[PDB]
């Protein structure tokens, strides 16, 4: 066995994620991505050892064809250590494509981080190991561009950014289009919904929805939440008028009822 260690923030190779030594938060799943599509998912999975101290039962679930995600059924307990062995290297994933290398990980579990945003009340309330430590008026997604209810994991974050309505096929041109300079943002969805900093509206945080989706805070709250949060933390949403985020967002892992997550997609 030759192993590399995984990164953080023909063949194919796989990456894996998280990166070697982070701590993450308790919604962060293993996720591991090939550069190739993979046409035989039980051959992937099967070359994938997962240990976590203490244990718990975990399972597979493919968001595309050549990425692949393994959690639990609840959220990580705090403290959780995870070693990810993915021995890929030579094994047959199907239709001629071979594993390049094995890549090895290992990773903990941070304090519990929740944040739920209640469109009944319009505040972002973030809790800390169970206890209320922030909260946060907060302005989501106007009615006709609202903010989808449900489970959002933390991804990246940035000081500053551009957030352009292009990258999810609405031209800025148009109504709901949008480029925008924004401060203190806290990606969590790969459908474009942040926590960032909205000085725009801070006469509408906590009484109006006025954003493309997004979760509009006062540039202090925004960027205390970007210095307080890591990547798998949770942002919870409830009682919009929207929908549900999609469990193959990229964040939305925890959309999946456990059952149809179990029962996984591999065919």
Same mark, same amino acid.
């Given at each position: 066995?030759?192993?590399?260690?995984? #990164?953080?923030?023909?063949?194919? %190779?796989?990456?894996? %994620?998280?990166?070697?030594?982070? !701590? +993450?938060?308790?919604?962060?799943?293993?996720?591991?991505?090939?550069?190739?599509?993979?046409?035989?998912?039980?051959?992937?999975?099967?070359?994938?050892?997962?240990?976590?101290?203490?244990?718990?039962? =975990?399972?597979?679930?493919?968001?595309?064809?050549?990425? +692949?995600?393994?959690?639990?059924?609840?959220?990580?307990?705090?403290?959780?250590?995870?070693?990810?062995?993915?021995? #890929?290297?030579?094994?047959?994933?199907?239709?001629?494509?071979?594993?390049?290398?094995?890549?090895?990980?290992?990773?903990?579990? =941070?304090?519990? !981080?929740?944040?739920?945003?209640?469109?009944?009340?319009?505040?972002?309330?973030?809790?800390?190991?169970?206890? +209320?430590?922030?909260? %946060?008026?907060?302005?989501?997604?106007?009615?006709?561009?609202?903010?989808?209810?449900?489970?959002?994991?933390?991804?990246?974050?940035?000081?500053?950014?551009? %957030?352009?309505?292009?990258?999810?096929?609405?031209?800025?041109?148009?109504?709901?289009?949008?480029r925008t300079d924004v401060d203190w943002a806290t990606q969590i969805s790969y459908s474009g919904v942040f926590v960032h900093s909205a000085p725009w509206s801070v006469g509408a945080q906590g009484h109006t929805n006025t954003s493309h989706g997004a979760l509009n805070v006062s540039p202090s709250n925004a960027q205390?939440?970007?210095?307080?949060?890591?990547? =798998?933390?949770?942002?919870?949403?409830?009682?919009?008028? =929207?929908? #549900?985020?999609?469990?193959?967002?990229?964040?939305?892992?925890?959309?999946?009822?456990?059952?149809?997550?179990?029962?996984?997609?591999?065919?």
């Amino acid at each position: 066995r030759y192993t590399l260690n995984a #990164t953080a923030l023909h063949l194919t %190779m796989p990456y894996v %994620m998280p990166g070697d030594g982070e !701590v +993450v938060g308790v919604g962060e799943p293993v996720a591991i991505r090939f550069d190739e599509n993979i046409a035989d998912r039980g051959a992937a999975e099967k070359a994938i050892k997962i240990t976590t101290n203490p244990p718990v039962e =975990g399972a597979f679930y493919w968001l595309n064809n050549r990425e +692949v995600r393994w959690r639990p059924e609840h959220f990580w307990k705090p403290g959780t250590a995870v070693d990810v062995a993915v021995n #890929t290297y030579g094994v047959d994933l199907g239709e001629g494509m071979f594993g390049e290398d094995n890549v090895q990980t290992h990773f903990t579990i =941070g304090d519990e !981080v929740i944040a739920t945003a209640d469109d009944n009340t319009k505040i972002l309330t973030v809790r800390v190991n169970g206890e +209320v430590v922030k909260s %946060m008026p907060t302005s989501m997604g106007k009615d006709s561009t609202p903010t989808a209810n449900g489970i959002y994991i933390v991804g990246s974050r940035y000081k500053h950014i551009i %957030m352009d309505s292009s990258t999810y096929g609405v031209p800025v041109n148009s109504p709901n289009g949008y480029r925008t300079d924004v401060d203190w943002a806290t990606q969590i969805s790969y459908s474009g919904v942040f926590v960032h900093s909205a000085p725009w509206s801070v006469g509408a945080q906590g009484h109006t929805n006025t954003s493309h989706g997004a979760l509009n805070v006062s540039p202090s709250n925004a960027q205390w939440f970007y210095d307080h949060v890591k990547r =798998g933390d949770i942002v919870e949403v409830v009682n919009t008028v =929207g929908g #549900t985020l999609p469990g193959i967002d990229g964040l939305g892992d925890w959309n999946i009822p456990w059952d149809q997550w179990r029962a996984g997609n591999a065919k």
